[PDB]
């Protein structure tokens, strides 16, 4: 997260860290047994870490639970990151509390200009590299599709939207991958891609979760 602020401990209780010896991606709790992340975050041997603030210090509200299965979207395309969504099942149900809470799936999409919350343990610099140990937050609006497509011609699908600031300086970044974009109390986006971080006229691109709600609901009821 570049240009954001410290969220504050467990102020984003649906935010998870995916860990395989180390944090490698964000995720969102959507019920006690299931997480939503990005397809480009797929790998075996995943441990889900909930209740986290400082990811390098055990502060007392953590729950560490291994993944029993992962389901990348059937239509994911690694070349273009179209349908960049994945579901991860917990081997045991998370114990939900104020610190470890699920985020609601959207009933409908969000419109351009809607303010959202983007969060993660990703890089905080526009040039160079600095990883925070505490959770960073960023308020950012959903941008119009035309400004999104103008920035990334021939690369944006109906399954993607841009959010952020065309002037730059505020954006998500590497290590934020898979993380939530929350608008009006719903999970509308997943941190997917972009050119650099916080670069002018290069806004962040997010997986459009509202297109996947039936697939999400169908998949977890059958797995
Ligand atoms: N500036 C941002 N908002 C932002 C946030 C998070 C990321 C992390 N994502 C990534 O690094 C993903 C993973 C595979 C290649 N990749 C890219 O961003 C490269 C460009 C992609 C590859 C294919 C279509 C465009 C990248 C950018
Ligand atoms: Ca911790």
Helix/strand layout:
Elements: E1 5-6, E2 15-19, E3 23-31, E4 34-37, E5 47-50, E6 63-72, E7 86-90, E8 115-120, E9 136-141, H1 145-151, E10 160-163, E11 180-183, E12 186-193, E13 204-208, H2 213-221
Antiparallel strand pairs: 1-9, 2-3, 2-5, 3-4, 4-7, 5-6, 6-7, 8-9, 8-11, 10-13, 11-12, 12-13
Bound molecules: ligand 49U and calcium ion (CA).
Folded structure, characterized:
This protein folds into two domains: 120 residues, Trypsin-like serine proteases (Thrombin, subunit H, Beta Barrel); 102 residues, Trypsin-like serine proteases (Thrombin, subunit H, Beta Barrel), CATH 2.40.10. Strands 1-9-8-11-12-13-10 form a seven-stranded antiparallel beta sheet. Strands 2-3-4-7-6-5 form a six-stranded antiparallel β-barrel. It has 223 residues and is mainly beta. The protein starts with a strand and ends with a helix. β2 and β3 form a beta hairpin. It is 7% helix and 32% strand. The structure holds the ligand N=C(N)c1ccc(CNC(=O)[C@@H]2CCCN2C(=O)CCC2CCCC2)cc1 and calcium ion (CA). Pfam families: Trypsin.
Number of helices: 2
Tally of domains: 2
Alpha-carbon Rg, integer: 16 Å
- Run of helices and strands: EEEEEEEEEHEEEEH
- Class of the largest domain, according to the CATH hierarchy? Mainly Beta
The strands making up the biggest β-sheet line up spatially as: 1-9-8-11-12-13-10
What is the CATH third-level topology name of the largest domain?
Thrombin, subunit H
Q: Can you name the CATH architecture of the largest domain?
A: Beta Barrel
User: For the terminal residues, how far apart are their CA atoms?
Assistant: 33 Å
- Structural class, judged by helices and strands? mainly beta
DSSP strand count: 13
Beta content comes to 25-35%
CATH superfamily of the largest domain: Trypsin-like serine proteases
Shape: globular
Q: What characterizes the major β-sheet?
A: 7 strands, antiparallel
**Can you give the helix content as a percent range?**
under 10%
The unique ligands bound to this protein are:
the ligand N=C(N)c1ccc(CNC(=O)[C@@H]2CCCN2C(=O)CCC2CCCC2)cc1, calcium ion
